[PDB]
Design a protein around this motif. Structure first.
Motif, short mmCIF file in Angstrom:
data_model
loop_
_atom_site.label_atom_id
_atom_site.label_comp_id
_atom_site.label_asym_id
_atom_site.label_seq_id
_atom_site.Cartn_x
_atom_site.Cartn_y
_atom_site.Cartn_z
N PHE A 1 -61.97 65.62 13.61
CA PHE A 1 -62.73 64.39 13.84
C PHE A 1 -63.50 64.45 15.15
O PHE A 1 -64.64 63.98 15.22
CB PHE A 1 -61.79 63.18 13.82
N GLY A 2 -62.90 65.04 16.18
CA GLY A 2 -63.58 65.17 17.46
C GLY A 2 -64.76 66.11 17.43
O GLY A 2 -65.62 66.03 18.31
N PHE B 1 -67.28 63.47 16.32
CA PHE B 1 -67.32 62.16 17.01
C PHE B 1 -67.72 62.36 18.48
O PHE B 1 -68.12 61.37 19.13
CB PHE B 1 -65.99 61.42 16.88
N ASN B 2 -67.62 63.59 18.97
CA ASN B 2 -68.17 63.93 20.31
C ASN B 2 -69.64 64.33 20.16
O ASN B 2 -70.45 63.44 19.84
CB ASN B 2 -67.33 65.01 21.00
C1 LIG Z 1 -64.69 62.41 21.88
O1 LIG Z 1 -64.33 62.79 23.21
C2 LIG Z 1 -63.36 61.96 23.82
C3 LIG Z 1 -63.06 62.49 25.21
O2 LIG Z 1 -64.22 62.35 26.04
C4 LIG Z 1 -62.10 61.93 22.97
O3 LIG Z 1 -61.18 61.00 23.56
C5 LIG Z 1 -59.95 61.69 23.83
O4 LIG Z 1 -59.25 61.97 22.62
C6 LIG Z 1 -58.02 62.65 22.84
C7 LIG Z 1 -57.37 62.90 21.49
O5 LIG Z 1 -57.20 61.65 20.82
C8 LIG Z 1 -57.10 61.81 23.72
O6 LIG Z 1 -55.88 62.52 23.96
C9 LIG Z 1 -57.79 61.51 25.03
O7 LIG Z 1 -56.97 60.65 25.83
C10 LIG Z 1 -59.10 60.82 24.74
N1 LIG Z 1 -59.80 60.57 25.97
C11 LIG Z 1 -60.57 59.50 26.08
C12 LIG Z 1 -61.71 59.61 27.05
O8 LIG Z 1 -60.36 58.49 25.43
C13 LIG Z 1 -62.40 61.50 21.55
O9 LIG Z 1 -61.19 61.59 20.79
C14 LIG Z 1 -63.48 62.40 20.96
N2 LIG Z 1 -63.90 61.96 19.65
C15 LIG Z 1 -63.17 61.19 18.84
C16 LIG Z 1 -62.42 61.91 17.76
O10 LIG Z 1 -63.10 59.98 18.97
#
Ligand SMILES: *[C@@H]1O[C@H](CO)[C@@H](O[C@@H]2O[C@H](CO)[C@@H](O)[C@H](O)[C@H]2NC(C)=O)[C@H](O)[C@H]1NC(C)=O
Lengths: 49, 111
Positions: free
Chosen positions: A40-41, A44-45
């Protein structure tokens, strides 16, 4: 029977009052045995869309 | 995901020197520009080229550069004695992990 007939006196006869049903004892959950995490990341990033 | 860069190069005053910065498909691929930076010994650093084609003010015209798909390179025409500094190539990455990734660094020697 008194509740079903809504009275304090029940006349001679045979009456139907409720339904018996066996209740379940335990829950069984089955899913496929996979472990890979969905990317998903990856979507979503992303710097530019 | 650091960018590859040769350790150092040597040259003589009066003729062109060239340096290169090479990466992979994830960092420099998908159409991502490369910028360059300086490092004067014991001095606050300064920019050389941004966008790989443009050029700022206050920099001599003897600098140029261009990229070839996976690699990038820059050329100095007529290096002088003040070019003793450290040079950095910087790019980005596909994900937000590598918004700013720099190379190891390269150094030039006159004469
Ligand atoms: C997009 O990037 C952000 C980080 O910049 C992701 O947020 C992190 O996600 C991980 C896994 O869930 C967590 O452990 C971190 O604590 C999160 N950090 C923040 C900044 O919230 C995000 O998950 C990524 N895209 C998605 C899948 O939403």
């Amino acid at each position: 029977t008194k509740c079903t007939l809504k009275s304090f006196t029940v006349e001679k006869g045979i009456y139907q009052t409720s339904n018996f049903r066996v209740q379940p004892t335990e829950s069984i959950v089955r899913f496929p045995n996979i472990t890979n995490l969905c990317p998903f990341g990856e979507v979503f990033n992303a710097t530019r869309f | 995901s650091v960018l590859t860069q040769p350790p150092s190069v040597s040259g003589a005053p009066g003729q062109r020197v060239t340096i290169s910065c090479t990466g992979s498909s994830s960092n420099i691929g998908a159409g991502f520009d490369v910028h360059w930076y300086q490092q004067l010994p014991g001095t606050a650093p300064k920019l050389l080229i941004y966008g790989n084609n443009n050029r700022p003010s206050g920099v001599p015209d003897r600098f140029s550069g261009s990229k070839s798909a996976t690699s990038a390179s820059l050329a100095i025409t007529g290096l002088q004695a003040e070019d003793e500094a450290d040079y950095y190539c910087q790019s980005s990455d596909s994900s937000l992990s590598g918004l700013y990734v720099f190379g190891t660094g390269t150094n030039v020697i006159v004469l």
